[PDB]
Design a protein around this nucleic acid. Structure first.
Lengths: 220, 220
RNA sequence: GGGACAAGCGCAAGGUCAUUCGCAAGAGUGGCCUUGCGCUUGUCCC
């Protein structure tokens, strides 16, 4: 729509309108100049800000603790919540009935990739321009405790809030030598059942769980 | 300290807070109290940016499927070592239990620039140039040459040929789901080894089935 | 608020396999299994 209404929101005046154009143009809308390449650069760029910000204002600093957060801070979901705060879905150039939330994220990254370039690849600046919009929206997610729960955890919360029951894991075989063996567990709930190979029991379960989740993503 | 004063000369930056450079070289065993863990987490997302940004600039093509393989190498444990060795990091390390490994060299490398970044005062644009000053050419060369990181189907391709002089066979078994969200299921086979792979496409499905077959062969 | 079950993570312990050492008496590293405690969360009960 208006490649200037978005500039107002962002708080940046594009001195290369052409960029912002591409960063918003999807593939099927223009297989001549889409956002793909910019998404690539934007993904690494946005990833940096998020991580640099998360390493400062964070309770614990151990890897095992920061990974769960960053998993959400850069997840498609959290990337949509920040995009909505820009009404980005109203500036995208794409064919109708083909756009989903994934595409929004790509455009989000592709966006800051464009501001980075435009501003003469000024990191420090773009970084500040990034916080001046989402820093608090990010710190909040942190302060709250938002994270990307692991599979077994997820599958549990699902099964319980739909049947108030839990999944049942059963080892079915163990192959190879002790110092290095492969486990094969079976995840089952109700009438569903999947398998999962893993160096260890738990690792094999996380697998069988991930597969079960997918299976549950259909209907009741 | 006299050692943590040599690396500075090689790096081209004077640490206004040597306390950082220290932790950016101290392993976990060496000192549980203060290690490079958290710093490698930040340096990872920072070193990635410099590389990607540089890659999208000096590159023949720009499409995604052409940049992925490259980036796969430029942030590879292998390529990282080649850069660290040009600063003899394996000398300034700080361990304890057992000897060293290439992996650690990579972590400490990213953990290194993570320090510089904070040391200079979170100055990105600065650290960026300070990074290209002694690597830009080293990287652009890898690109110009065409150093990539072969995919799974290819890797499986080379293996199966250098052991049986034969190639694997991929067969589609099913395409479940609705026409607007169909998922393919191919079957990779070679001799008496088979695996399955789920994918949004036929090729994607194959890359999966392959990666699983490589691990089967990876056995013995 | 107090619990029952469960999950993830953390700390530790025991066992086992592999591996390294060795004044052969022992001593380390890693993979896996089991247990306890802590932290967080989910479903349930009070």
């Amino acid at each position: 729509k208006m490649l200037e209404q978005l500039e107002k929101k962002l708080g940046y005046t594009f001195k290369d309108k052409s960029l912002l154009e591409k960063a918003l143009t999807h593939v099927s809308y223009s297989k001549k100049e889409h956002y793909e390449t910019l998404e690539f650069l934007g993904d690494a760029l946005v990833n940096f800000f998020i991580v640099d910000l998360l390493v400062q204002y964070s309770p614990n600093k151990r890897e095992g603790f920061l990974s769960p957060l960053k998993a959400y801070l850069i997840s498609e979901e959290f990337f949509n919540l920040l995009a909505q705060k820009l009404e980005l879905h109203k500036f995208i150039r794409i064919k109708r009935g083909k756009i989903n939330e994934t595409i929004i994220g790509d455009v989000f990254e592709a966006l800051w990739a464009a501001v980075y370039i435009d501003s003469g690849r000024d990191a420090n600046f773009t970084r500040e321009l990034f916080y001046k919009l989402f820093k608090e929206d990010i710190l909040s997610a942190i302060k709250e405790g938002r994270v990307k729960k692991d599979y077994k955890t997820i599958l549990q919360e699902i099964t319980q809030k739909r049947w108030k029951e839990r999944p049942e894991y059963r080892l079915i075989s163990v192959e190879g030598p002790h110092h290095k063996k492969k486990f094969i567990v079976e995840a089952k709930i109700k009438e569903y059942r999947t398998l999962g190979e893993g160096k260890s029991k738990k690792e094999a379960e996380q697998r069988a769980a991930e597969e079960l989740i997918k299976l549950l993503e259909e209907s009741e």
